[PDB]
Design a binder for this molecule. Structure first.
Ligand SMILES: [Mg+2]
Ligand SMILES: [Mg+2]
Ligand SMILES: [Mg+2]
Ligand SMILES: [Mg+2]
Ligand SMILES: [Mg+2]
Ligand SMILES: [Mg+2]
Ligand SMILES: [Mg+2]
Ligand SMILES: [Mg+2]
Ligand SMILES: [Mg+2]
Ligand SMILES: [Mg+2]
Ligand SMILES: [Mg+2]
Ligand SMILES: [Mg+2]
Ligand SMILES: [Mg+2]
Ligand SMILES: [Mg+2]
Ligand SMILES: [Mg+2]
Ligand SMILES: [Mg+2]
Ligand SMILES: [Mg+2]
Ligand SMILES: [Mg+2]
Ligand SMILES: [Mg+2]
Ligand SMILES: [Mg+2]
Ligand SMILES: [Mg+2]
Ligand SMILES: [Mg+2]
Ligand SMILES: [Mg+2]
Ligand SMILES: [Mg+2]
Ligand SMILES: [Mg+2]
Ligand SMILES: [Mg+2]
Ligand SMILES: [Mg+2]
Ligand SMILES: [Mg+2]
Ligand SMILES: [Mg+2]
Ligand SMILES: [Mg+2]
Ligand SMILES: [Mg+2]
Ligand SMILES: [Mg+2]
Ligand SMILES: [Mg+2]
Ligand SMILES: [Mg+2]
Ligand SMILES: [Mg+2]
Ligand SMILES: [Mg+2]
Ligand SMILES: [Mg+2]
Ligand SMILES: [Mg+2]
Ligand SMILES: [Zn+2]
Lengths: 60, 155, 95, 96, 125, 206, 81, 23
RNA sequence: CAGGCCUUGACAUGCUAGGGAACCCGGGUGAAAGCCUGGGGUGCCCCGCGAGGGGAGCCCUAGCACAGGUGCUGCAUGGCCGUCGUCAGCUCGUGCCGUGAGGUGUUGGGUUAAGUCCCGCAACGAGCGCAACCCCCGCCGUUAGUUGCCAGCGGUUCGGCCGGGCACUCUAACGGGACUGCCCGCGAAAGCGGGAGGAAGGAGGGGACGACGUCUGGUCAGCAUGGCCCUUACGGCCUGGGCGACACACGUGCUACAAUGCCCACUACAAAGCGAUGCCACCCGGCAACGGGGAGCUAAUCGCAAAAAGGUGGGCCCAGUUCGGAUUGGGGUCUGCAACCCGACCCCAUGAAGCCGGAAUCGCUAGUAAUCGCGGAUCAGCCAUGCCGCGGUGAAUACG
């Protein structure tokens, strides 16, 4: 049970409870961000790459 | 303190008697940062220090502190196969710190229900030479003395 | 008390009490063995036995490694014994 | 009032001076760029792909707002501002 | 008519008006005594006035916002201190070495990840 | 197993973003998810071009989609034909106004992504890896830089035991906030497995 | 818990108000542990799923507000030692 | 106290309102 | 895990033998999945007045070629991370020394947070690390004002509310300021002590950053990837169970054993954030959770909001208690298709252990520990006492 999984989260099934964020890049269910569409890993890779608009290493 | 000497902070004098020794004391009464609390106790006690035994609560306080500060104490070194309790004089720094500490500590073991009373009474007795604190002093001091002959292993 | 972790392996009540029995050797020194923990583990070369134990005079840590699991465990105790005799006798150089 | 949004504050404040000081000539009385408190979105993320929960780097997202007021509009300030030098992203607002 | 200084300690700002008079003081629309009742640190940030031997010389209108009562006091401290030194700036001498101006920069430290309270670390084996 | 990404570490300082725009909550995800489809479409198709970096812009239904490159030819083409076949397919997914763009890169051997994917394809090509690495640095320093560093890791020359190969000339001070360090990464899938390549180019102080 | 509505699946609901109508039988197999025991069920044998088995429960007016699952428990315990 | 639902301080910790810490 | 189902597949590209396409709705059945099934009818390049027609959007069936596999190996791997360790280190070039491994430099004296810097020196340089360049805080300047203001007057329905103003406070962008630069003292120098001015001095405090390498460290279950393995099954859909089981053992934490405390009622002072099928003012029903209505806000202009400890004054009177709130009985609310297993909250009743903890053991040097509340991610709800942040009050001690 893996790639079939990412497909199963696409078309929205019987009840709306069954809604769960997966992520676009990796099929990761765990630690997906709503704002990015991303997991915490994928998020990191992209941010560091400079591909996330106005996203910067924080530091205060 | 490997490196240099460790600064001794000075302290804001208090807004009643204008004397550093009181705040240190109030600091030692304090618990979980609640300083306002730590204040009223000392002062309330000061009400009581005048109320009963009409006098100068400042005087009483500052007296029972000198009646507590230990002149000589043991600090134990390992030499060979035994740990010797060793006689050494306490710095004025350490005496203050040991003064205030035992005072409070012995205060809070009194049977009086209200904290400031406990503080009131313990101080009144220490002024006179009676109490848990004073004991601890005399005690520490007889434990020095009797070790007089370990005064050579002294740093 | 004593805990044993068989990591990525199917262990048994019998061999568990065997390791409890081999560790008993350190009871010889008559010194408190505090929450001892052994970990048994496979490996392509051979087994691995680790243990980490604290005692009033310090802590013991060591790894046994070997083809036979039992000789790995023995090796582990052999290494532990040494460490324990050292914590026990070290400052006796008290001259 | 014309509200300015967007992430890079250097890009933005360039085009808060453009728009405001544009309509200074072509209009009046141009109430200067007023910085709004910036809305920060923090993301704290676990550095590694695996366990290691005590190692993390913080990532934030800085979205800052500016309001600019032009006192008397002077229509054709509604033309000289009906285009302008952008830059590549920023949010323009206009209302009365 | 007036004398100004700006006090701050720890996310708190005091605006102090040194306007001359009886010595009545108002903080956020009520006398010192009503706004700080209880707290003994309240006796006070008025200490800067007793510093230059004027006690009653001035009244004070004071707004204060940010932080909490004590923080607010220490702000009033560099307030009545900054205001009074402005009034007759032969006033730095005996206010300054008495450590009255010079706002303390001591603030809360960021909580750091992996620690609990920004220094207190969690327990281990 | 320690080092911070030298691009991510300078975002806003030496270096700047390759997708530049503004959004806000309701549509960010989507905007963004577009870019990364665009990026995939491009990086696949535009592979043997060269390049390094794709800057991207947005206003409304307007994608500027800039592409810097090694040899612009495989984009523009004969008379500028294929530039348009792409300007199409982008738009087909973009569902909005695409602008396909080509900027040429100056000394493709001064660019990090570009130098690293060359040594990369050279490794898939079965070359002495240690020598491939000295060279790829040699080329950079010859065409100028203030220093250069290059890293391969994996079954280098096919060795059972993994190994990691390292070479550098001149400065590469990754602790300095104004480095201008161009860093780029490629990947060599060989008959035996994957090897990572990292290049570092020190262009100079800002 | 569960404020206004009375929850029975309207799958075994149907089944019970039919069997009661004509000549009432037994052996209704269900996997719904979520179903309340509704007074129309009172007396029957329903076969309820705990997940490896369909466990039969005689219904009695002793138990109504409950759920059909409560009487076919999911864990086989027996003890320790 | 902080664990006792029936008290003010109880509800505060628990982050709720009721008879004992009303709105 | 148990049972019920699917095969060219839930999914990619491509080729074909039938039919068709697209699409929306029931049915019969079943727990559902699935199986079995009654409908309407395809624009289009189009011989067309016609039957009809060709194509290909797109569906199916049959057939493959294949897909798919969170199956194995982190000692075959990339990538990213933990760690020694913010420790002061690790090396290269040429030269010199040794048959050689290798030495030298890098050691030595002195000083620093530091291979920091000074002075020596068969060495002379160079690089990766230190520092600095970046962010936050502390002081001042500018630019700027639908946030702030009787500071100023006027009005003032008394709400900075209107007028009016940017002085304030602030907000958020750009600057300045700290340099051992100045005095004394010592030194050969680097630099140490002491002083002045300064909001701040000796790295002003906190952050981001973490060398060559180590642990055959960690992850094939985020992703990727070599190789091995399964192909009506190690693939795929579903209903249900499980991941919450409980003789036991450890680790992290919550709340406590009370009077420096507990309870009630009135009354203060933050910061950072977050809000459109969201944040809900306010009105009403309800003891309440909540439920009705219902205004504002794409939000410095509305809302979450109450901050809490504190302040006041009243009760409790040393009691396993007006300490502590576990456990259980019963009655309700809300989310959700559904709260048996298994949600959170509210109310009534129940008020367990616990009187400060063995061997052993953890954290913290100052706005720190302790203590007090607040926000956020993830999220229908929530088992958060967790985590990441934020301010409030605010200690003790460092001989060595
Ligand atoms: Mg959910
Ligand atoms: Mg704090
Ligand atoms: Mg921090
Ligand atoms: Mg933790
Ligand atoms: Mg740990
Ligand atoms: Mg109670
Ligand atoms: Mg408490
Ligand atoms: Mg039916
Ligand atoms: Mg490994
Ligand atoms: Mg690895
Ligand atoms: Mg492993
Ligand atoms: Mg030779
Ligand atoms: Mg050599
Ligand atoms: Mg060395
Ligand atoms: Mg250091
Ligand atoms: Mg150096
Ligand atoms: Mg204005
Ligand atoms: Mg101004
Ligand atoms: Mg650094
Ligand atoms: Mg291993
Ligand atoms: Mg994988
Ligand atoms: Mg092969
Ligand atoms: Mg299932
Ligand atoms: Mg679990
Ligand atoms: Mg226990
Ligand atoms: Mg806990
Ligand atoms: Mg508003
Ligand atoms: Mg009892
Ligand atoms: Mg009780
Ligand atoms: Mg309960
Ligand atoms: Mg019940
Ligand atoms: Mg008992
Ligand atoms: Mg008692
Ligand atoms: Mg204790
Ligand atoms: Mg306690
Ligand atoms: Mg420290
Ligand atoms: Mg939530
Ligand atoms: Mg919380
Ligand atoms: Zn992802």
């Amino acid at each position: 049970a893996r790639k079939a999984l990412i497909e199963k989260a696409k078309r929205t099934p019987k009840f709306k409870v069954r809604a769960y964020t997966r992520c676009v890049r990796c099929g990761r269910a765990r630690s997906v961000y709503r704002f990015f569409g991303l997991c915490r890993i994928c998020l990191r890779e992209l941010a560091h790459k400079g591909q996330l608009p106005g996203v910067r290493k924080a530091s205060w | 303190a490997r490196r240099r000497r460790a600064e001794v902070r000075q302290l804001q004098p208090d807004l009643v008697y204008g004397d550093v020794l009181v705040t240190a004391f109030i600091n030692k009464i304090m618990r979980d940062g609640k300083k306002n609390l730590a204040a009223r106790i000392f002062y309330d006690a000061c009400k009581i220090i005048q109320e009963k035994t009409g006098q100068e609560p400042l005087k009483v306080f500052k007296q029972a502190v000198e009646n507590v500060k230990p002149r000589m104490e043991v600090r134990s070194r390992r030499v060979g196969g035994a740990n010797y309790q060793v006689p050494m004089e306490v710095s004025p720094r350490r005496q203050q710190s040991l003064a205030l500490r035992w005072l409070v500590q012995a205060a809070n073991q009194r049977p009086e229900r209200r904290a400031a009373v406990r503080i009131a009474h313990e101080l009144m007795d220490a002024a006179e030479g009676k109490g848990g604190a004073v004991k601890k002093k005399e005690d520490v001091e007889r434990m020095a003395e009797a070790n007089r002959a370990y005064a050579h292993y002294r740093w | 008390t004593m805990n044993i972790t068989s990591k990525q392996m199917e262990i048994t009540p019998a061999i568990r009490q065997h390791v409890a029995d081999r560790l008993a050797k350190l009871e010889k020194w008559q010194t408190h063995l505090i929450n001892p923990h052994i970990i048994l583990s496979k490996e392509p070369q051979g087994f691995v036995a680790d243990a980490t134990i604290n005692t009033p005079n310090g802590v013991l840590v060591a790894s046994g490694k070997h083809e036979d699991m039992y000789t790995a465990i023995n090796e582990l105790i052999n290494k532990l014994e040494r460490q324990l005799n050292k914590l026990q006798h070290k400052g006796e150089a008290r001259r | 009032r014309i509200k300015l949004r967007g992430f890079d504050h250097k890009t933005l404040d360039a085009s808060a001076q453009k728009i405001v000081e544009a309509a200074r000539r072509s209009g009046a009385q141009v109430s200067g760029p007023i910085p709004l408190p910036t809305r920060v979105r923090r993301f704290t993320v676990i550095r590694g792909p695996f366990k290691h929960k005590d190692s993390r780097e913080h990532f934030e997202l800085r979205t800052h707002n500016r309001l600019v007021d032009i006192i008397n509009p002077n229509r054709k300030t509604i033309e000289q501002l009906m285009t302008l030098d952008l830059p590549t992203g920023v949010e323009i607002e206009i209302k009365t | 008519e007036q004398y100004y200084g700006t006090g701050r300690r720890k996310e708190a700002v005091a605006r102090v008006f040194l306007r001359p008079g009886n010595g009545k003081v108002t903080v956020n629309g009520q006398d010192f005594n009503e706004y700080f009742q209880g707290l003994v640190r309240a006796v006070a940030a008025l200490e800067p006035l007793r510093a230059v031997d004027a006690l009653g010389h001035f009244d004070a209108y004071i707004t204060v916002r940010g932080g909490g009562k004590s923080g607010q006091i220490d702000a009033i401290k560099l307030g009545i201190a900054r205001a009074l030194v402005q009034y007759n700036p032969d006033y730095r001498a005996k206010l300054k070495p008495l450590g009255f101006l010079t706002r303390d920069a001591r603030v809360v430290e960021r909580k750091k990840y992996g620690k609990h309270k920004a220094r207190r670390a969690p327990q281990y084996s | 197993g320690n080092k911070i990404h030298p691009i991510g570490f300078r975002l806003g300082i030496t270096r700047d973003w390759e997708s530049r725009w503004y959004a806000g909550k309701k549509q960010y995800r989507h905007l963004l998810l577009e870019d990364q489809r665009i990026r995939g479409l491009l990086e696949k198709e535009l592979y043997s071009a060269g390049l390094a970096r794709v800057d991207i812009e947005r206003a409304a239904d307007n994608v500027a989609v800039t592409v810097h490159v090694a040899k612009p030819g495989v984009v523009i083409g004969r008379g500028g034909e294929r530039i348009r076949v792409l300007r199409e397919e982008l738009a087909k997914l973009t569902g909005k106004n695409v602008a396909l763009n080509v900027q040429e890169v100056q000394n493709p051997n001064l660019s990090a992504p570009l130098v690293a994917q060359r040594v990369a394809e050279q490794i898939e090509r079965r070359f002495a890896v240690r020598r491939a690495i000295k060279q790829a640095v040699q080329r950079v320093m010859e065409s100028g830089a203030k220093g250069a560093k290059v890293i391969v890791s994996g079954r280098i020359g096919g060795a059972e035991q993994a190994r990691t190969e390292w070479a550098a000339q001149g400065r590469v001070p990754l602790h300095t906030l104004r480095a201008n360090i161009d860093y780029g990464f490629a990947l060599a899938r060989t008959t035996y497995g994957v090897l990572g390549v990292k290049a570092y180019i020190f262009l100079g102080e800002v | 818990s569960l404020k206004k509505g009375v929850f029975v699946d309207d799958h075994l609901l149907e089944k019970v108000l039919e069997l009661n109508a004509k000549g009432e039988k037994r052996l209704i197999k269900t996997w719904s542990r979520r179903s309340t025991i509704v007074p129309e069920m009172v007396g029957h044998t329903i076969a309820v799923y705990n997940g490896k088995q369909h466990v039969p429960v005689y219904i009695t007016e002793n138990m109504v507000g409950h759920k059909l699952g409560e009487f076919a428990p999911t864990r086989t315990y027996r003890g320790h030692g | 106290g902080k664990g006792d639902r029936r008290t003010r301080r109880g509800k505060i910790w628990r982050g709720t309102y009721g008879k004992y810490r009303p709105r």
